Design a protein around this ligand. Structure first.
Ligand code: NA
Length: 262
């Protein structure tokens, strides 16, 4: 077992339920303070001890919807999860990496803020990022910098595999089969193929998915849940109970380097 582990021994049904074992509350973050634009912190209630913390970032101009599903969903298994608002002063992947870093810095600071609802809840050494589109390129950039312990690019877009090739964190890429914005063959697939051998990694292509398919809140929640929640459990919490879900008709392609070393 792991000192960080939370919640019951898992199952597929537990992962695919709308919520995990913890009740969740939320708290708004101002753009004036944050450095990253606004956001929303989701956190479990009725818990003690520190837990992993995750930034969830969007990144597509004129998006019709965003990544909000991940907030309450992931927090309810035992994480502090902050979604970033859609309309911000950030745009292409370089700026998204800065945005992510500013959001991580902000969350670290909350652990010691007397007046924060998440005071004392954050293990500042156990940080993850989930990021969509240009935010997915940003996620790969930040994964290469060596602070975060887990990365989940959603339908990532970028101009280079340079950062993917240098990822320092366990990386799970969700690809969207039918994506016309960041086509898999030009973005998610070559990014995955460039990832180092020295990290745990996975590639999950979601059958029929548009560019929005990794965002949650549509018809793909089962696959997102099984792989995404388990990714954070294994990699932020060192929780080997979740290896079983990582190592199917909704999946049109898969790659990985199981078995993952404990
Ligand atoms: Na297709």
């Amino acid at each position: 077992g792991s000192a960080y582990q939370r919640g019951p021994d898992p199952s597929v049904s537990f992962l695919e339920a709308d919520r995990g074992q913890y009740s969740v509350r939320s708290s708004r973050v101002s753009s004036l303070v944050s450095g990253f634009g606004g956001g929303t912190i989701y956190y479990p209630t009725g818990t003690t001890g520190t837990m992993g913390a995750v930034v969830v970032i969007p990144g597509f101009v004129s998006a019709e919807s965003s990544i909000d599903w991940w907030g309450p969903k992931l927090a309810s298994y035992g994480f502090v999860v902050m979604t970033i608002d859609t309309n911000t002063g950030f745009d292409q992947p370089p700026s998204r990496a800065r945005q992510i870093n500013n959001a991580l810095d902000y969350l670290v600071s909350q652990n010691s803020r007397s007046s924060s609802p998440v005071r004392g809840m954050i293990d500042t050494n156990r940080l993850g990022v989930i990021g969509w589109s240009m935010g997915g390129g940003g996620t790969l950039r930040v994964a290469s910098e060596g602070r975060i312990k887990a990365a989940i690019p959603l339908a990532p877009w970028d101009t280079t595999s340079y950062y993917a090739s240098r990822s320092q964190a366990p990386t799970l890429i969700f690809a969207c089969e039918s994506d016309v914005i960041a086509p898999v063959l030009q973005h998610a697939s070559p990014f995955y193929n460039s990832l180092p051998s020295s990290i745990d990694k996975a590639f999950v292509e979601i059958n029929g998915g548009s560019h929005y398919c990794g965002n949650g809140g549509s018809i793909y929640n089962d696959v997102l849940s099984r792989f995404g929640v388990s990714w954070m459990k294994l990699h932020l919490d060192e929780d080997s109970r979740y290896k079983q879900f990582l190592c199917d008709s909704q999946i049109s392609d898969y790659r990985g380097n199981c078995p993952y070393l404990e």
